Enzyme design. Structure first.
Site, mmCIF file in Angstrom:
data_model
loop_
_atom_site.group_PDB
_atom_site.id
_atom_site.type_symbol
_atom_site.label_atom_id
_atom_site.label_comp_id
_atom_site.label_asym_id
_atom_site.label_seq_id
_atom_site.Cartn_x
_atom_site.Cartn_y
_atom_site.Cartn_z
ATOM 1 N N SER B 8 -3.467 -8.791 -28.274
ATOM 2 C CA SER B 8 -3.497 -7.784 -27.229
ATOM 3 C C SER B 8 -3.648 -6.361 -27.752
ATOM 4 O O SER B 8 -4.262 -5.534 -27.088
ATOM 5 C CB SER B 8 -2.246 -7.878 -26.364
ATOM 6 N N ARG B 31 0.391 1.515 -27.908
ATOM 7 C CA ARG B 31 1.499 0.778 -27.320
ATOM 8 C C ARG B 31 1.724 1.155 -25.855
ATOM 9 O O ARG B 31 1.972 0.304 -25.016
ATOM 10 C CB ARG B 31 2.770 1.025 -28.132
ATOM 11 N N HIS B 34 -1.096 -0.440 -23.960
ATOM 12 C CA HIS B 34 -0.870 -1.868 -23.941
ATOM 13 C C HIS B 34 0.155 -2.203 -22.846
ATOM 14 O O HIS B 34 -0.045 -3.119 -22.057
ATOM 15 C CB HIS B 34 -0.357 -2.318 -25.295
#
Ligand SMILES: [Cl-]
Lengths: 198, 206
Positions: B8, B31, B34
């Site tokens: 991912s 992050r 994500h």
């Protein structure tokens, strides 16, 4: 404070063109409000009678099974008590733990009839939402399923699957979603279920 | 399970595109994207000079993490908090704070409490929900409070824009999500990114 109120004012006013039943707009508004992302006006899909299903479950004192602790602690207890609803963070349950941990939660769930009539909130585990769309194919019948996993792998299918399952649902189309959207939609359902539906 | 997360992260790096972030700043923005599948954070996320390094250092020092919402407190991963044992303190829902609050803004009680108790100095502060909290804290900073780092990511339509400005012109390192966007999920993701970078001694192994 009333900041909540004025914030919603700004949201509606700024929302633009929206087509949602008087009972489901309040859900989308809250979701927009929680993310400052108007794209939810377009992404949030409901099935037939999703809200009523939710309002009834909530009023019926239903159980809220969630796929993340962030969701559990996010649910304002002063709102959960109104109809006294039990929140169950499966993946963190000692039994489920002791024994992916997503499938262990469902099993432990199909092993107590919890899935039936319960409101299920998914904001993280796409796989988990698959151990449910299949478990639904095997009879399990939850009142409502909030299919809002955020992510890049297994998220499109998991949601596509749910929008094909024979149960009430509210989904965030695409890769977007998450604990905050699940929490926002729940607080909106508890608010209506307590306001009679207005 | 771990592979999926690595996968991912790959995917986000592939669809990010040109960005103006440093080697230490990128892992944080990645992050956050994500965690939200929201690519606008590439453009909305802004860092102050030395912010990330200030964060790793505090993380490694065993600095406390003060947050403005339980979702943030619970969102954090216990196994990750364990690496450098960074205590988490939820102020707004804190007993004493709420107690003081009722007595006489629960956001004021929070800072005042935190300050008086000596918790702001050396601490990493995470705000993803209470703008008035970030304003109180910013005023408290002008009085001698020195948090190691401040994540100003409140989301909303009331006091949000000004709360961030009050932070981006202050004497403390910070990381902000420009605009009305932000939220618990962004703070958690940014903190997890800081911890992982620290664990890897400042090297982006991801
Ligand atoms: Cl772009």
């Amino acid at each position: 404070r009333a900041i909540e109120e004025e914030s919603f004012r700004i949201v509606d006013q700024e929302a633009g063109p929206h087509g949602f039943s008087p009972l489901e707009w309040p859900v989308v508004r809250r979701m927009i409000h929680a993310t400052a992302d108007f794209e939810y006006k377009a992404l949030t899909r409901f099935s037939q009678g999703a809200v009523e299903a939710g309002l009834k479950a909530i009023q019926a004192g239903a159980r809220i099974l969630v796929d993340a602790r962030m969701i559990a602690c996010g649910l304002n207890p002063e709102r959960l008590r109104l109809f006294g609803n039990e929140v169950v963070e499966l993946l963190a349950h000692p039994e489920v733990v002791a024994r992916t941990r997503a499938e262990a939660a469902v099993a432990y769930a199909w092993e107590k009839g919890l899935l039936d009539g319960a409101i299920v909130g998914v904001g993280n585990a796409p796989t988990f939402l698959l151990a449910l769309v299949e478990a639904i194919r095997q009879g399990a019948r939850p009142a409502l399923v909030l299919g809002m996993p955020v992510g890049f792998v297994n998220v499109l299918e998991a949601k596509r699957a749910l929008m094909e399952a024979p149960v009430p649902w509210i989904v965030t189309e695409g890769r977007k979603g998450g604990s905050t959207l699940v929490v926002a939609a729940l607080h909106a359902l508890i608010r209506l279920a307590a306001d009679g539906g207005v």
